Amino acid sequence: SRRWFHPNITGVEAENLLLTRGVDGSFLARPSKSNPGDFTLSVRRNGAVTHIKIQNTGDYYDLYGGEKFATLAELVQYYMEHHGQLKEKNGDVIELKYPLNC
């Protein structure tokens, strides 16, 4: 199924879509314009949207740091199930609560 992965969407369309179709805690994954091959998590927090870059080497998936995963689903479900491990410099956690779908 992998319904949270939107294959044909820009970051600004995703950013708008989360503020219409989702709630705080909603999120999705997209293919990333800035670096083809990579992916990007787009999450909603406190009425606004944050974007997180995901490195795909070919060998593994990661967030330019942290735990490394064999597949993208393993990475997304990991950070869903371990909420505190996704933190920003500020100190705030970024929570992947509710997947948004096609």
Partner: peptide, 10 residues
């Protein structure tokens, strides 16, 4: 576009 948040790790 809009910026990508700066993630930190233990």
């Amino acid at each position: 576009q809009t910026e990508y948040a700066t993630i930190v790790f233990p």
